[PDB]
Every structure is written in structure tokens, then in C-alpha cells.
């Protein structure tokens, strides 16, 4: 019953990823796409937290922390690309 | 300097749980890890 | 269902609902600036609420204080505002217009100079 | 290594010393040092007449590569001795001539004598080898040394054209012959010729008998310039004349005649041997005599002459093979006569033709021309050259009392006996042979009259020639006068050759025909009365003179206008064609277009994996031994598939990077569902650095475009893409199912047991990487390190292409 | 589940193959990145999926998912990262020099 | 031209945390997810975020590592560790571990796998930074 | 122990890495590189003698027994390939010392050279299929940079195609290992040979045999999977084209030999017939490419394709004699084909060009170059008694003994086309009137020819001393045609 | 603050030896007396007692969480309304906060609070540009920045 609820929430999280993905395709703007991408990655942390309760394991606790770091590095770099056309300044 | 010592203990706070050893071996590894991090970042953080 | 399972249930059902809301918001808000409201706030609380549930689950049911889950909460809080700022300001500079029914744009002036 | 081994290869050893002698003894014409070797090998071989002429043979062997059955075996019998004396006797005389024909001041004597001694040692090696692969080895070195001599004036286009044409026609024949020699081994187990002749029943019973015969005759007929391979011989005349005298008239063009005479005891006795030798012989006889008549350079006439006369010798070997068919149902004398005529004519031919190349060479050397249109009147100016030339041309025409009359009368005898054969369809074709041979004898006589009257008669025209004309120096004259003298000696005293030379060579060629210690009767004489063969000869003389007196008439014809052989068009077009065709076939593959390369490779993979999956019935699926799909995996998988299918429709690069990210993140999510945390981690970190890299590259690259849907191009692409996807899946599903049936315990249950006890870790993946399979990890960081150093080199080093070479 | 993942591999191979048959330099590099993803997902699926715990012995599970393929995939991902880096730089250096990203324009002289 | 007060503030905090986490990932590898590759890429990500957040001239003064020598030294550290067994007459790349006792710390496991995996780690950081920085600074 | 088995991998790997620390010092780079290639050669010769006297030496890395650990297996075939890579490694480096710019020395030329050689030796020696993939990747990435280094426009457009195609073939290798792992649960080549034989090479194990054939056929240069090769080899400097020409395709050919003599041996009516057909098509289409070209270095690049066809012709016939022919052919081809690219280098130094139509008369100005080229070129064409003759003759004789008449005929016809191609280079560049200048006529090339001299000497010696080389090839062929010798060594 | 925390740990460190416990809960007893020790002596020394600032911070963390919950309630209303009834715009909002870490705290709190998102800062850092979902109600937002959010930052700040 607790495991039934975790399954329902994993389905809802899956649908959420589906709905973020639609804007990565359709935009309309590049800014829109990088926002959807940023939200897709944050939602993956949710999905894994719940997989860890269902599988009852802490093997994935490093994965959630890496995703949070990488989704951030991804968004900062794509935001700067869009605005300036360079990821790194000075060079 | 009091700042850097507490940072180092804050690194060791961040560190110690991860291992979950709660032994002298792991805390001493943890306090030293932060010394190395602080040394690497000394110029970045202007320490 | 045990009282621990109920508390953890609430947190996972809120977290999963706010995640979906965040995504529905990325669809329904009229421009990238309103969609950053949903991305920055709902996606963020949704994921904070699931990490709490996960944290409380290993603590109250397995007696394990998993402090990496809390460090994940902290990274998400630190990072969410700055990411939304860098995505919204990049859009504004690149010329993505505010929505037509928007009624005030103090930032346009500033970027005039 | 016997002395007889050392003699055989001795000319290769001197060839190594020739460049030093030229360098450090230039005072002396290098030929003086070369002359001693063929002259001592001549005297050496002359000592074996004591054994061969008493029925003996000498055989010695040393192994060379016995694991392939290749042994260096030297074998002296009548046949091989005869060719060793020609090669070393006429060799001696041609070196002597070359000392006075090549001036040591401007000529590369070192190149000349190395090529020439290479040939000489290769020719002895051909005729003294009992192992067919050692004979092949020397046979191809004669083709090589021959083309190097045709090319001696390598700055001239004609020289290089002839050197190529010889090498291609003769090596083509040599490669086919090697296939022939390999079939004999497959029949008999030996490359020894004497051992193949012992097992001759295993040859004639075999289904590989005729292919082996054809392949062998391809080699013989290319090297001996039988029709249609004779076209290389006229183009070899670009050589310096000593070479034409030695290689292309007296020795190397007789290597195919040697090989056919040597393998008559394996192949003869059959209609196909009879007809391949007798027909190709008679056409070559007729084609070369007719072509010679229209040549207008002395060496042109003599080259076509040699073609013709080789066809005459090949026809006699062909007629003579009937001795083997009849065995002792007939007197051995009867059809063995043709084999005695062939041997006698080969000797005669070497004497008159070697002498006529030497006089053509003197005429060129002392008038600057070899053109029968510009010569005339040189009888009184060049009387020794005139006399030797007269003798050679009269012998070649078969006028008495010279050596060539006897041999031409023995030819007409052999031909008329063959008409009596009543086998092999000779009841029908015997007279065609006799008539075609008779016509060829008329044309031979006529090309000899043309060469004689146009060169030496009429009025000497001093203004045709640049230089003032004088006889040659005595040194140049000695070699043609000694050869001219033998024309006369063998004409009056033929029976000097009868039991010393000719009879032993007959026993080598017809070894089953007579009991041991039985000799053939050989008595050669000039007068046999008023028989058919004398009328045939009177015939030839008359017809020849008539056609010569009618030349005012037929010289205006279109036949006489041309001189180049009409088969040359084939040779020439076939060569241009290999190049054109090659280029067409190569262009369709190597289009330069990376899509074509991937489409060829993937199309080939689909057809071959597809065919193998049908042939071994490997399309299969196992739906039982699968794990469950939670409902959330259906949605994740649908996103993963949608994201992946959208990529070909994206036309903005930043969208592409975002959807690649999505795909990257979702593959990390699958790795978590599939219990692979170390993969999820790695996959996420690599995906992040790959997104920074794609954007660092996007500063340099242009934007994506919608590229237009060429219907054919992009539907073929679609069908190939689906076919790769479908086969990767089908083979995935079939591998899963065989894996499940098989139930082999995976080797990785050892890592489960022993990661913590024997390697001290609990993370089995890390333990495998650093401990059980640590070498792979060390090699993988080396891949990264090379890629990083490569990226530096690729960005920082920019060279023009003119810096190094 | 091995069936569904074998089909997903099929789809990465099919799109990745379609992209390498296009004229765009960037699309070829992306096709090559998708084929790598497919091969790596294939190597995991072929070992059997969801067959036990993540391969960490301190979990004291009965069955672990097979660790050997996981170590093969790690190596393959890491190599592939190295090579893709090198290939992206080679691609842009090629574009800069030829001023074209169209592979039709990179054909070169015919019968060179 | 851009006020980055918030990006520069956050980049300073997160960098501390990512580096600490990268060192944990490196040491945890033997018994938990992590190791040289994951640690190295995580450490590279921390230095890249500093380049992203600030600019190349400033961060190159701040963290002035020679990433190319780190490749060569990384590789040699990993090769040399593999000769351990040639001391005890064992095949190349034999790995050894013992539980020693140190009073200060406690029971501790020493392994040749640690220096081996440190060599992997140095190459991985070295190559990530050499590749990304060489491209980013490609003027021509 | 058998730690000697790893020295052919570890010396170039260690020296390669050390030379990155000395990028600035060019003299020290050359001296180290020079001693190192010579000691690789003495290590390789010593390993080959040991294995010859004392049997297969197996090294279990990490001390883990097969099939759990990576094994290296030095058998007689592997140790011959290790010597041959060492010979051309020495010669191509001493020729590079006389020819490459100092600019390439600044950018890691010598470390990439040694990492290529380590990769090639690891590929010959590994007893593990995934370890073969990784050694192929070390070889390939070192070739990716060596082939493009300099970044001329040609090099960038052709190198770009070479890398894309090779990346694709590396993916298909992974696909193959996925499917064979699913069936067998092992990567060890011996353990594979045992398990595949337990399963009787049933069903999809045939399909999997064909995927390995294609993967290794793409790396070997068999038709129709060679498009990456002919244009790419033109771009790098002669010392590197010689080493690539001579050795890199041999790693794919060795893998096809090792895989279809050890693992997939149960249905040669299918698999080895398929290999015979690709052999014959590779000989033929290779040599048409060669005949179509009028550029010295492009003609030689197509001859590589043609000649590898002969090496898989003996595996297709699959007898002791054919296999031993192929093993000798492999030794002859490495030696001759590396010499030929080195002669095209020295011809380009003299004339500035590789285009035959712009050349002529080098025989008059540079006879030592001309006669060394000629001897190598007729060896390639199969003219006796050089190495080329004996090795061709063992294959055709094996083909006739086995009644493979069509492939016997293709191998003879292709020989004649090769002769035609080598005589075109001689007629156009060495014969003729002098098309090069007077300054070019006085360029002295002997310093470039000395490194090539041993390869020329070896084609002569391998011809004359064919009997000991052929007896060694027969023993290799015996060893590998019985999978149970390798199997018992390792398991 | 860092001085006092360090002192307190020194006091506990020694105290646990004296109290013969390297056991955990004693460190707390020890640390607590270190607090009372420092509190008693704060007037004796010059110390802004550190626990006032530690409390300021706890309350700021609570506010970050309270505002995020409210922000999500605002978002739910808007997104589940049949029709988007929003009147958005960009407002320049003055700030007194002078330091970079205070501005960073404020810009982060605004973006986690109801209806608002920090876009940009003026060059002089005297204005924070805010994307607001309802500009009509801007006076409430400007009042909350001034009277709740900057008041709470300055307690941890000064
Ligand atoms: C052998 C296989 C035999 C079958 C193949 C056929 C070979 C045909 C070769 C024809 C050679 C023709 C020789 C040319 C005549 C000659 O020597 O010309 C001299 C010229 C260079 O001489 P130079 O020192 O420059 O001084 C010029 C003034 N005289 O020319 C030269 O001296 C150039 C050099 C000529 C020969 C070069 C051979 C080089 C071999 C290389 C490897 C050496 C060792 C091989 C033996 C191994 C045994 C241990």
C-alpha cells in the first residue's frame, strides 16, 4: 500500500518528464528549451529518490547529488551560449 | 583563520556522514581532506 | 499503513504533485518568464519534498541518517534561484519578448543604456 | 653444390663483380673480362659430350626449399647439353662482338654486362634444371633480364615500350605455366621432371591433363613467340644489336622450344598435343614469313623471320609427337625423323640468324641506317659483311649447299610423312599443313631475296649516308665469320653433329621409343634424288623468284604499305582498357562521399547478417525468461524513443544539444533502474562534459540547415537505417534466447565470491576495474591521454605541407 | 524488459544510422554518439536486466546484477568520451579550413 | 557589463562542495560507487564551473596547474604501481591489501589499488581540463 | 611468471609517457626514441626465441587465472607479429629521423609513435576479446592523430572520414561482444573457444561469427569495407605511411586469423567459404584501384588492400599449407610494403612529387634508389626468387591441392596486374628522360636509403633462406590449426 | 562568530577529557557549558554573542522554506485556474543591502517567494529587477522585500 503509492508517484513523475520534454522539442524559443531541460533534470532527482524507497537502497544517493550539480552546470553554460555565443569568457 | 578552521570542520561535517564510519581514522581523513581543499582554493577564495 | 509510512506518503505525494504542477506550468504560462516561475518554485519544492521523504524513510524505517540527501536539498536551494536568473536574464538580453499582455518593463530602460 | 651447380649460376656471381671491374679497371672494355666466362663454360660443357654421346646423363641435386618440394637439381642429357653449348658458344661470340659494337666511352657497360650475365645464368638454369619450380625461377629471371636489355636505352620511348610489352606477355605466360607445373605436382607428387616422366600414367589418366597441357604451352608459346604472342619480338629490336643476336634470335626465344622438347615425354601421344604444336606452329610459320616480306628495316625482317622459323621448329616437334602415339606399331625411324629435323634446324637457325643479326648490326654501325629503302650497293664497299650475309640468307632460304637446305629438305620430308598418318584427322588436314608450309617457304625465300638485293645490289649511293661507308673493324667481323663458317661446315659435314649432338637429343625427347643401348640412325646428306622434297624446293625457288620479279607491281598495294602487325591493336587497346576500366570501377566505389561509404558497408552488413539469420534459422524470441516492466518504465521508454526519433527532424543546433542531453539523462535514469549506479554516475558526468564540448565546438561550426529531401537518396537511407535497427534487435533477441537455453554459468560469479576476500573491496565494479581487469583500465586512461595530447596537436600544429617529405 | 530494451537499442541504431547517412558534419557526429549509446545499452541488456541488487557486496543480497558488463560499459563510455572529443575538434578544424560543413563539398578531386 | 554578484557568490560556495564531494567519490570507489574516473570527472566539473562562473584569465591565475604534466605523471603513477608484484615475484599489475593498525587512526586498509586509482584520477582531471581549455582558448 | 610477455607493451607505453615530459628537448627525444625501438626489437627477438624453445608463455595479469583475469598469450604466431612490428618500428623511426620537420617533434610525434606500437603489440598478445577491443582503441586513437598531424586541408578532409568510419567499426565490435557475452558469459578467447564448441556453434553463434568477421574485416581492409584506407594514407609523412601501410591492417588480419582458427571453427563450409570469397574480391578490387592510379603513394595504398586479400585466402583454404603460406605472406608484406612507402618518400624528397606523369629519369641520377625500389617492387609482384615468390607459391599450391581453382586463378591474375602496376612506376619515374631539375639531380639520398636497406636485404634473404622461414610458418600453422594447444595453455 | 564557535569547541574538547567521556552526548553538555561560559563572559570580553546570529540564521532558513510553500500555493492557483488570469511585468525594487552575500541572499529569497523572480541587478547594485506575475499587487511585494526579507537578512548580516 505504501509501495502502491510509491508506484503511483513514479508514474506521475514519468508523466512530468514527458511534459517537460515536449517544450525541449517545441520551444518556441531556445530559452524555453533550456528551461524545460533544467526542469527535466531536477525532476530526475525526484524520480531517483522514489526509486531508492521502492528498491529500499542507498546505492543511488550519490546519483541525486551529481544530477543536481550537473543540471546546474548545464543550464549556466547553455544560458551563456544563447546570450553571448561563448561558454567561457576571456579566451 | 578562525573562519578557515571552521570551514575545515564544516568540510569534516560534510565528510563524516558520507562514510558513516564515526571512527578517528575517518575523521582524521576528513579534517585533512578539507586542508587540501582549502589549499587548492587558497587563491580563488583569497585565503 | 504505519504512522511513519503516512508521514512519508504525504511528502512523496506532495513532491510528485508539485513536480507535475511545475511541468504543467512550463506548458501553460504564456512566456518563458512565467514558465521560470514554475520551474524555479514547483520543480524545486517538489524535489525538496521527495528528498525529505527519502531522508525520513531511511532514518525512521532503517535508522540511517543519510546526510547526502540533505546536501542535495541544500544544492537545490542554492542553485535554483541563480539558474532561473541566468536563464531569464539570458532570454531577456537575447531579445525573447515579455508576453504581449505584460504591463511594465523597468528592465527595458536599464538595457537602453 | 657440385661444380656443375657452380657453373650453372656462375654468371650471376660474375654479374656481382662487373660493376667493380667497370669502376676500377675502366682502361679495359668490361667485355674483355666478361668474355672469359662463357668461353670457359663452353669448354667445360664440351667435356660432357663424352657422357651424353655414350647414352649417359649426369644428375646432381641439393635441396633448396624441400618443404615445398623445391630442390636445385642439375641434369645433363643430350637435350640439355645441346642448349648449354649454344648458350655458352654463341654467348662467347656475342660478347666478343659487343666489345667492338659498344664503345666504353659513352656506354654504360656495367648495366649492359650485368643484365646480360643475369640472362646467361638464367638461361643455363632453365635448360639444366630438373625441378619444375627451379626451372620456373630461372624462366622468370630470363624474362626479367630480357626486358632490362630491351630497355637498355631507357630514355627512348620505343625501348621502354618494348621492355614493358615483353615483360607482360612473357610473364603472363610464365604465371600460367606455374599453374600448369602446380597441376603436375597435384597429379604426381613431384616437381621433378624425371620423376613426373616415371609417373606419366598418373598424368595422362587425370582430369587435369588438358588444363595442365594448355597452361604449360601458354608459357612455352609466349617465350618462343608463337602466334598470337609473337608481337613482343618485333618490338624487342630496340635493344642493342648484340642482344638481338644472342637473346631474341638464338637462345631465349628457344626456351619454349626447349620446354616443349623436354615435356614431350609427359604430354605427347595425344591429339591435343599434336594439334596445339602443329597448328600453332604452322600458323606462326605462315604469319611470320608473310609479315617479314613487308618489313622495311633489316631487324624488322629478321625479327619476323625468327618468329617464322620458331614456328617451323614448333611444327616439327608437333609432328614428331606422333612417334609416341604409334610407338612400335611403326618403325621408330619414321616419325622420329621429324624430331631429328627439329633439332638439326634449331642448330642451323642459331648459326645463320645469329650471323645475320650481327651483319645487320655492322650495317647500321657503318651507314647509320637499317632501312632497306636507303641501303643499296654495299657489296663492293663491305665485302666481308656481304659474304657472311650472302651465306646466311642463302641458308635461311634453304638454297644448297648450306646448312639450311638440308634442314628445309628434312622439313618437307617430315611434312609428307605426316600426310600418311591416318590418325588425328590428318586424312583431311595433312595437305593443308603441307600447302601452308610450302607457301611459307616461298615467302621465306622472297624475304631473303628482298633483304639481299635491296641491301647489297644496285649502285652505292654515297649521299644517302651521312658518314663515309667502310667495312667494319676485324674485331666486329670475327663473330659473324665464325658463325658464317659453321653455316658451311654443317652444310658439307652435317654428320659431325649426328651422333655427338643430334642423336642424344633425340633420345632425351623420345625416351620410350627405343630399348636401352639402341641408337637412332642419323645420316644427313645433301642429295636424295628427284623426289617430292626436291620438287617442293625447286617450287619454292621459282615461286620466290617470280614474286620477287613482280615486286614492282605488288609494292604499291596496301598490304606492302603497312609494316606494323595488326595484332598490335589488340595489345594496345587492351592496355588502355585495363586503365580505363580500372578507373571506372574504382570511381564508383571511391566517390569521396562519406554517406556512400557508410551505405555500402551497412548494406553489405544487412545482406550478410540477414542471409546468415535466415540460413541458420536464428530469428527467435524468448518471451518467458524476461523480467517485468513496472508501469513507469513504459512512460520513460516512450520518452526515450520519442526524443531519439525527433533528432533527424531538428534543424537548429542548440535544439540538437538539448535533446541529446535529454537522451543522456534518460540513459542515466535507465542505468539506475537497471541497478548500475557506477554507470549512472559516469554517464551523467560524461554527458555534461560532452555538452560543454559541443558548445565549445559550436563557436567554430556553422548552424544546422534543413537539407532537402532528395526522394531516392533519403529513401534508400531510410531503408538501410531500418534494416540496421531491425537486425540489431533481431540478433539481440536471438542471443538472449540462446543464452537462456544454454545456461552457461557466467564467469562473473567469481567476482561475486572473491571481490571482498581476495581483492579487499565491496564495490564489484570498481574491483573489476582496478584488480581483476586492471590492464583495461590502465589502457583506457591511455586512450584519454592520447586524445588530449591529440587535441593539443590538432589545434596548435598547422603545417603547409612543404616542410617535410 | 530485455525485449523492450532490445527494441529501444533498435531505435537508437536506426536513427543513429540515419544520421550518419546525412550530409551535415554535426549530424554525423550526433549519429555516432547515438550509436555508442545504443551499444552501451545493448551490452547491459544482453547481460540480463533487473536480476538482483546493484553489485555492492555490503548489501548482502542474494543475487546481484552482473558486475562484469557494468565494468565493460564503464570502459567503453570512457573510451568513447576520448574519441568523441577528438572527433569534434577534428570536425571543427575541418570546417574552418574548408569553409563548409556539407560532406558533399568535402568529396575532393575525382580519381584523386 | 553583466552584474554577476549572484553567480559569483554561488559559484564560490558550490565549488567548495563539489571538490569535497569529488574527493569523497575518489576514496569511496573500493567499497561504494565512485573511484578514479568518477572522482576525476567530478573534480574536473568543479574546475569547469569556476571557468564558467568567472573568466579564463582570473581562474588560470587562481588554479595554475599544468594539466599536461598531470597526464604524464598520472600515467607513470599508474604504470609504476603495477610493478609492485615484481618485488614479490608476481605478475605485472598484481594488487595487494593489508589491514594494518595505527594507534592514531585505528584499523586501516592499505591497498596498491589506491595509488593505482590515484594515477587514473590524475589523468582524468588532466585530460578533461586540457581538452576543454585548449579548445576554449583556440584563437585561430 | 612470464613477465617478459608484457615487455613489448610496457616498454613503448613507459617510454611514450616519459617523452611527453621532454617535449621541448628534441635531441633527447630522438636519442631515447632510438634506443627504445632497438630494445623493443631485442625484447621481441628474445620473447620469440623463448616461445619457440619452451612453448606458449601465458601471463596472467593481476595473478588472476583465465578466464577471470586478462591473460596475455605469446604463442608462435603472436611472437612473429611482435617481431615484424618491431622491425618496421625500427626502420620507420630511423627514416623519420632523416625526414620529419622539427615542428612535429614539438607536438608529441614520438609519444604517439610509441603508443601506436604498444597498442599493436597488445593486440597481438591479448587472450581476451574485450581487451582486444581496448588495445584496438589505443592503436586507433594513436593512428587518428598520426594520420592527421600537420592538419593540411587534404589531411583534415580524409582523416575526418578515416576517423568516422573507424569509430563506427568500434561500435560494431561492442555490439558483437554484447551478443557473445549473452550466449557464453565469458570474454576469454580460450574460454570462448571452449563454450562455443560446447554449443556446437549453433544458430545465432553463426551470425555472431559473421559480425566478428565484418568488424575485423573493416580494420583489416577487406572488400567491401576498405573505403577508409586508400585516400587516408596519402596524407601523413612517408615514415608514418610506411608504418601504417606495413602494420595497421595486419592487426585486423591477425584478429580474423585468430578468431577463425581458435573460436569459430565448427562450420568452415560456411564461415571459411565466406572468407575465401571476400579474399578473392579483395585481391581483385584492390589491384584495380592500384592500376587506376598515377600517383606513387596512391598506387601503394591500393596495393595494401590487394595484398591482404592473399593473407585471408590462406585462411579461407584452411589447410596447413595454406595457413603456413599466409603466415609467410604476412612477413613478406610487412617488409616489402614498408620498404615501398619508404622508397616513395625518398622519391618525393628528390622530385617534390608522387605524381608519375611529372617524374622521369631517376635511374640515371639515383641508381641506388632505383635498384632498391626495383627489387622491392618485383618482390611485391611475386618474381622469384624474392620473398614475394615463395609466399605466393605456397598459397597457389595450397589452393590447387585443395581444388580451389578459382581463387588459384584470381591469385595468378592479380599477380600479373600487380606486375603491371609496379612496372608503371618504374617506366614513368625511373626510366624516361630526366624530368627533375639539376639541383634535384644532385640531391644525395643515401642517408635516406640506409634505414631501408635491411628491409631490402630481408626480402632477398627471406627468398633465398625460404626453407627455415617456411618451416617456422608450418609450425605456426600447426599450432594454430589445433585450438586445443592454445586452449590447454590458457585453461 | 568564527572566533566564538572555535572557542566553544575548545572548551567542549577539554571538558570532555576532564569529564572522561569521548562519548558523544558529553560533547553536547560540554558545548552547552561553553555557550553559558561565553554568554557569562560576553560582557567581560567584547563579544557579539554568536548564538544571536545562529538564531537569526535558523529563522532565515525557516523563512526560505515558508515563502517557498506559499509560492507554490500561488502557482497552484494560477496553473489550475481554467484561464490564466495573470498581469505580469518587470519591476525595479530598491535595496539597502550593501554586501555581495547579502544581495545574493535577497535575490535568492525573492525568487523563492510568491509571485516573483529575480531577473537582474543594477550596475551599482541599488536595484533588483523583479519579474512579477501580478504587477497590480506590486506594493505588497515591495513592502515584503523591505519589511520582511531585508529585515531578516540584516539580522544575520549585522
Ligand atoms: C638480388 C635479386 C636478384 C633478382 C632481381 C634482379 C635484380 C636486377 C638488378 C640490376 C642491377 C644493375 C646494376 C647496375 C650497374 C651498377 O652497378 O651501376 C653502378 C651504379 C651505382 O654505382 P656508384 O657507387 O654510384 O658509382 C657509379 C660509378 N660506377 O649502380 C649501382 O651500383 C646501384 C646498385 C646496384 C644494386 C643495388 C642492390 C642493392 C641491394 C640492397 C641490399 C643489399 C644486401 C642484399 C643481400 C643480402 C645478403 C646478406
Author numbering:
A (entry chain F): 1 to 91
B (entry chain e): 1 to 47
C (entry chain G): 1 to 113
D (entry chain A): 1 to 805
E (entry chain C): 1 to 112
F (entry chain B): 5 to 144
G (entry chain D): 1 to 491
H (entry chain E): 1 to 158
Provide the authors' original text about this structure:
Multiple resistance and pH adaptation (Mrp) cation/proton antiporters are essential for growth of a variety of halophilic and alkaliphilic bacteria under stress conditions. The CPA3 family comprises the larger Mrp (multiple resistance and pH adaptation) type antiporters which have received much attention because of their evolutionary relationship to redox-driven ion pumps of the complex I superfamily. Group I Mrp antiporters consist of seven proteins (MrpA-MrpG). The stoichiometry of the Mrp type antiporters is unknown but is predicted to be electrogenic with the number of transferred protons exceeding the number of transferred sodium ions.
In this work, we determine the cryoEM structure of the Mrp antiporter from Bacillus pseudofirmus at 2.2 Å resolution. The final 3D reconstruction of the protomer yielded a 2.2-Å map, allowing us to build a model including 1957 amino acid residues, three phospholipids, and 360 water molecules. Most of the 360 modelled water molecules are located on the hydrophilic protein surfaces exposed to the cytoplasm or periplasm as expected, but about 70 water molecules are found in the interior of the trans-membrane region. During model building, we noticed clear alternative side chain positions A and B (called alternate locations or altloc in the pdb) for several residues and conformational variations for short sequence stretches. Furthermore, we observed a pronounced structural rearrangement in a highly conserved sequence stretch close to the N-terminal end of TMH8 (positions 246 to 252), resulting in alternative positions of several residues, including strictly conserved His248MrpA. In MrpA, His248MrpA is located at the junction of three hydrated pathways. In the C-terminal domain of MrpA, we modelled Glu687MrpA in TMH19 with two alternative positions of its side chain. With a probe radius of 1.2 Å we identified a putative sodium-exit tunnel originating above the strictly conserved Phe41MrpB that is separated from Glu687MrpA by the hydrophobic Ile77MrpC and Val686MrpA. Strikingly, the tunnel is blocked by one of the two alternative conformations of Phe41MrpB, suggesting a gating function for this residue.
